[PDB]
Design an enzyme around this catalytic site. Structure first.
Site, mmCIF file in Angstrom:
data_model
loop_
_atom_site.group_PDB
_atom_site.id
_atom_site.type_symbol
_atom_site.label_atom_id
_atom_site.label_comp_id
_atom_site.label_asym_id
_atom_site.label_seq_id
_atom_site.Cartn_x
_atom_site.Cartn_y
_atom_site.Cartn_z
ATOM 1 N N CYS A 95 21.055 -41.774 69.129
ATOM 2 C CA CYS A 95 22.288 -41.084 69.510
ATOM 3 C C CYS A 95 23.383 -41.373 68.482
ATOM 4 O O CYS A 95 24.044 -42.417 68.545
ATOM 5 C CB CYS A 95 22.710 -41.506 70.908
ATOM 6 S SG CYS A 95 24.213 -40.688 71.419
ATOM 7 N N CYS A 134 26.722 -41.856 69.911
ATOM 8 C CA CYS A 134 26.908 -43.106 70.638
ATOM 9 C C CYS A 134 27.154 -44.274 69.686
ATOM 10 O O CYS A 134 28.084 -45.062 69.892
ATOM 11 C CB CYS A 134 25.687 -43.384 71.512
ATOM 12 S SG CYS A 134 25.183 -42.032 72.595
ATOM 13 N N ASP A 135 26.339 -44.391 68.629
ATOM 14 C CA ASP A 135 26.280 -45.598 67.806
ATOM 15 C C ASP A 135 26.610 -45.402 66.334
ATOM 16 O O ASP A 135 26.706 -46.404 65.613
ATOM 17 C CB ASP A 135 24.886 -46.260 67.905
ATOM 18 C CG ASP A 135 24.439 -46.452 69.340
ATOM 19 O OD1 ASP A 135 25.292 -46.841 70.172
ATOM 20 O OD2 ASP A 135 23.258 -46.228 69.646
HETATM 21 C C1 LIG Z 1 19.427 -45.996 73.381
HETATM 22 C C2 LIG Z 1 20.412 -45.075 74.053
HETATM 23 C C3 LIG Z 1 21.779 -45.343 73.964
HETATM 24 C C4 LIG Z 1 22.716 -44.507 74.574
HETATM 25 N N1 LIG Z 1 24.064 -44.821 74.461
HETATM 26 C C5 LIG Z 1 24.937 -44.022 75.054
HETATM 27 C C6 LIG Z 1 26.353 -44.332 74.920
HETATM 28 O O1 LIG Z 1 26.826 -45.296 74.317
HETATM 29 N N2 LIG Z 1 27.190 -43.433 75.581
HETATM 30 C C7 LIG Z 1 26.781 -42.319 76.299
HETATM 31 O O2 LIG Z 1 27.629 -41.609 76.855
HETATM 32 N N3 LIG Z 1 25.450 -42.033 76.403
HETATM 33 C C8 LIG Z 1 24.582 -42.846 75.805
HETATM 34 N N4 LIG Z 1 23.236 -42.559 75.910
HETATM 35 C C9 LIG Z 1 22.826 -41.368 76.673
HETATM 36 C C10 LIG Z 1 22.906 -41.571 78.181
HETATM 37 O O3 LIG Z 1 22.285 -42.804 78.537
HETATM 38 C C11 LIG Z 1 22.181 -40.431 78.894
HETATM 39 O O4 LIG Z 1 22.723 -39.185 78.468
HETATM 40 C C12 LIG Z 1 22.301 -40.551 80.415
HETATM 41 O O5 LIG Z 1 21.840 -41.839 80.837
HETATM 42 C C13 LIG Z 1 21.578 -39.465 81.183
HETATM 43 O O6 LIG Z 1 21.490 -39.875 82.559
HETATM 44 P P1 LIG Z 1 20.534 -39.165 83.569
HETATM 45 O O7 LIG Z 1 20.914 -39.787 84.910
HETATM 46 O O8 LIG Z 1 20.487 -37.715 83.502
HETATM 47 O O9 LIG Z 1 19.058 -39.743 83.162
HETATM 48 P P2 LIG Z 1 18.457 -41.127 82.677
HETATM 49 O O10 LIG Z 1 19.552 -42.011 82.114
HETATM 50 O O11 LIG Z 1 17.294 -40.869 81.795
HETATM 51 O O12 LIG Z 1 18.071 -41.837 84.053
HETATM 52 C C14 LIG Z 1 17.003 -41.344 84.888
HETATM 53 C C15 LIG Z 1 16.380 -42.525 85.601
HETATM 54 O O13 LIG Z 1 15.541 -42.047 86.675
HETATM 55 C C16 LIG Z 1 14.288 -42.696 86.603
HETATM 56 N N5 LIG Z 1 13.236 -41.810 87.081
HETATM 57 C C17 LIG Z 1 12.679 -40.771 86.386
HETATM 58 N N6 LIG Z 1 11.659 -40.208 86.994
HETATM 59 C C18 LIG Z 1 11.552 -40.920 88.179
HETATM 60 C C19 LIG Z 1 10.659 -40.821 89.263
HETATM 61 N N7 LIG Z 1 9.674 -39.915 89.333
HETATM 62 N N8 LIG Z 1 10.803 -41.703 90.275
HETATM 63 C C20 LIG Z 1 11.768 -42.622 90.194
HETATM 64 N N9 LIG Z 1 12.665 -42.814 89.221
HETATM 65 C C21 LIG Z 1 12.494 -41.932 88.231
HETATM 66 C C22 LIG Z 1 14.094 -43.038 85.129
HETATM 67 O O14 LIG Z 1 13.147 -44.087 84.931
HETATM 68 C C23 LIG Z 1 15.511 -43.451 84.743
HETATM 69 O O15 LIG Z 1 15.685 -44.826 85.084
HETATM 70 C C24 LIG Z 1 22.268 -43.388 75.297
HETATM 71 C C25 LIG Z 1 20.905 -43.121 75.394
HETATM 72 C C26 LIG Z 1 19.971 -43.953 74.774
HETATM 73 C C27 LIG Z 1 18.501 -43.644 74.892
#
Ligand SMILES: Cc1cc2nc3c(=O)[nH]c(=O)nc-3n(C[C@H](O)[C@H](O)[C@H](O)COP(=O)(O)OP(=O)(O)OC[C@H]3O[C@@H](n4cnc5c(N)ncnc54)[C@H](O)[C@@H]3O)c2cc1C
Ligand SMILES: Cc1cc2nc3c(=O)[nH]c(=O)nc-3n(C[C@H](O)[C@H](O)[C@H](O)COP(=O)(O)OP(=O)(O)OC[C@H]3O[C@@H](n4cnc5c(N)ncnc54)[C@H](O)[C@@H]3O)c2cc1C
Ligand SMILES: Nc1nsc2ncccc12
Ligand SMILES: Nc1nsc2ncccc12
Ligand SMILES: [Mg+2]
Ligand SMILES: [Mg+2]
Ligand SMILES: [Mg+2]
Ligand SMILES: [Mg+2]
Lengths: 305, 305
Positions: free
Chosen positions: B132, B135-136
């Site tokens: 990202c 992000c970084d």
């Molecule tokens: C390394 C990294 C660094 C980042 N740094 C930043 C930052 O500094 N700032 C920022 O704004 N964004 C950052 N992001 C992006 C941000 O984390 C994501 O855009 C955000 O978390 C999306 O959230 P979400 O809830 O849609 O999904 P996700 O964060 O992917 O969360 C979904 C969760 O649901 C769980 N899940 C999935 N399928 C199932 C299932 N069948 N049963 C049970 N649980 C399940 C997954 O395991 C996961 O824990 C970063 C991403 C990464 C990879």
């Protein structure tokens, strides 16, 4: 001096846009207004903003975001924008007798909740008077409260609130409700709700917190007092689009239209976020999300120039 | 026992949905997964999430949201959902040998960033390896870094990063780039970017932090080492829609489609939020915003039943 981006507004939308634009090195110039900080400046505890297990007050949260924007280099000005010229490659904002120009403008002016305009309303806000059942209905468990308004929103606020309140008195100046039939029959069906048509609030009583409302019949002038400890105002919102009317396309209610799921307006280089656009969710966390998107949109658009 | 709402996922989208649903007294049942907490669990400092003037680590932020959900009464389960039946008035989720049912389901499973699959990649994440640039990229000022990928995203990540990095080496396994012509010519034009076609990373070196990458030519097998202190992986994302394929409508890339600016899917009573839906912004704050909207949608839909 032509800046990369100017942001108008200092609620969650504008400050989140500023954080992202500043961290992206765009040196954003932000006009916060003299009544800066957005709507959360005017409330007490904010419990549904994710990230604070124990809650945080509105002003505390908003000062966190303001210092966060400053830390990354945003140029914040506690001044109102009085006029804008948004068409063309160089956009101008007018602040009193001063002008500032930018290549992109993010509109984040928010929406005003319509007020009753009665004594006690402003003083008792966050202390018994609210505009947001989702935000504060929690705090009125087993209490007698009123909802003011005649539309779908007031209908929805009143019905939602009955899962907390002992009783809900729904007050409306006319005897016609502009709410939809389905919404109207829902609260008619609700046993915790009583309607008062042809009734207005003339005053809100409250020692430190709301203790009662003074009422008046709009037909006969008959007045009385009602003992209640909450007053939810749901008489509509006015998006703060006056600056941009005739320049950016608005919907019939004055909200700024955006393309699809983006923040792009009808004008090139002009982006809009927060409750200026959204008449559906109207939360700090959704406004913050859309302010982030506006900054990402603006950055990508600036890169394409 | 039929719950009002089941939430699948524990990133910002799912936990914000849980906070709102629990505060709305819907007693949400949340399946977090065994790898709970979403993508921020796997990073270090999160600086662009509005509300923390001094930043907060990914796990700290995510534990705040988890405790916040618990405080309002969400039922959190650190278990994976293995199968779902989403059609009809009563929806079923299958968790190992256990079943749970609800009237509404909020899909918040997120998107996986595609990984290189090489030694050092996982260990050095948040320590020089990132997915990202928004992000970084800040943290790599005046450093030599690599970007891996052949599409528009990698093109956009590489060009964005040149406002921080000393140099950017863009690495791609083939000699054809799937990125658009405009994106391709942009970084060609950028003097801080050098392309390495027909090249893969076989290993990331790093004492505590990234010090270099081992490279291999995919045609000749020739190997060499490159001294760099950051590795940005931009080879695509895979929305975690496998559970719902054939039940909810997906776009050609597997993202869950939603109606207009809402979280409504093609199935009645099923709502979707976060990076499962959004292939554009992909931030914690936007995912949190959309999780809030999913809970408001679900609440309004449940009220209409
Ligand atoms: C390394 C990294 C660094 C980042 N740094 C930043 C930052 O500094 N700032 C920022 O704004 N964004 C950052 N992001 C992006 C941000 O984390 C994501 O855009 C955000 O978390 C999306 O959230 P979400 O809830 O849609 O999904 P996700 O964060 O992917 O969360 C979904 C969760 O649901 C769980 N899940 C999935 N399928 C199932 C299932 N069948 N049963 C049970 N649980 C399940 C997954 O395991 C996961 O824990 C970063 C991403 C990464 C990879
Ligand atoms: C009393 C109250 C309590 C609330 N409690 C909660 C809660 O607990 N949780 C929650 O999620 N939401 C809550 N909300 C809603 C939330 O505050 C709003 O949805 C959110 O602040 C919208 O942010 P915004 O940035 O779009 O606009 P706003 O918050 O309205 O901010 C816009 C700002 O820009 C300024 N501005 C406008 N025009 C100009 C101009 N021309 N020049 C300069 N500056 C200008 C305005 O003065 C204002 O300061 C509450 C709202 C109210 C009224
Ligand atoms: N003071 C009021 N009581 S009801 C109503 N409706 C609109 C504007 C004001 C008021
Ligand atoms: N290890 C790699 N180097 S380039 C690339 N592209 C796709 C998948 C893996 C890799
Ligand atoms: Mg104003
Ligand atoms: Mg305000
Ligand atoms: Mg998983
Ligand atoms: Mg994860």
């Amino acid at each position: 001096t032509v800046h990369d981006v100017i942001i108008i507004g200092s609620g969650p939308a504008g400050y989140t846009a500023a954080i992202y634009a500043a961290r992206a090195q765009l040196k954003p110039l932000v006009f916060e207004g003299t009544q800066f900080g957005g709507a959360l400046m005017t409330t007490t505890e904010v419990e549904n903003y994710p990230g604070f297990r124990e809650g945080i007050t509105g002003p505390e949260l908003m000062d966190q975001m303001r210092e966060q924007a400053l830390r990354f280099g945003a140029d914040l000005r506690m001044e109102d924008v009085d006029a804008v010229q948004l068409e063309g490659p160089v956009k101008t904002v007018v602040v009193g007798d001063e002008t500032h120009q930018a290549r992109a403008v993010i509109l984040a002016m928010g929406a005003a909740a319509r007020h009753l305009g009665v004594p006690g309303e402003e003083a008792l806000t966050g202390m018994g008077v609210s505009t947001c059942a989702t935000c504060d209905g929690f705090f009125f468990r087993d209490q007698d409260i009123v909802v003011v308004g005649g539309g779908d929103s007031a209908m929805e606020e009143a019905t939602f609130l009955t899962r907390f309140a002992r009783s809900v008195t729904l007050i409306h100046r006319r005897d016609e409700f502009r709410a939809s039939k389905i919404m109207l029959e829902r609260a008619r069906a609700n046993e915790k709700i009583t309607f008062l048509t042809n009734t207005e609030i003339t005053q809100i009583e409250g020692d430190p917190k709301v203790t009662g409302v003074r009422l008046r019949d709009t037909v006969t002038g008959e007045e009385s007092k009602l003992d209640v400890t909450g007053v939810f105002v749901a008489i509509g919102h006015d998006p703060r689009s006056e600056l941009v009317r005739g320049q950016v396309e608005l919907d019939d209610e004055g909200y700024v239209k955006v393309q699809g799921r983006t923040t792009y307006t009808s004008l090139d280089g002009v982006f809009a976020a927060g409750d200026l656009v959204d008449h559906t969710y109207r939360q700090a966390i959704t406004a913050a999300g859309s302010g982030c998107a506006a900054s990402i949109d603006a950055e990508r658009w600036l890169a394409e120039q």
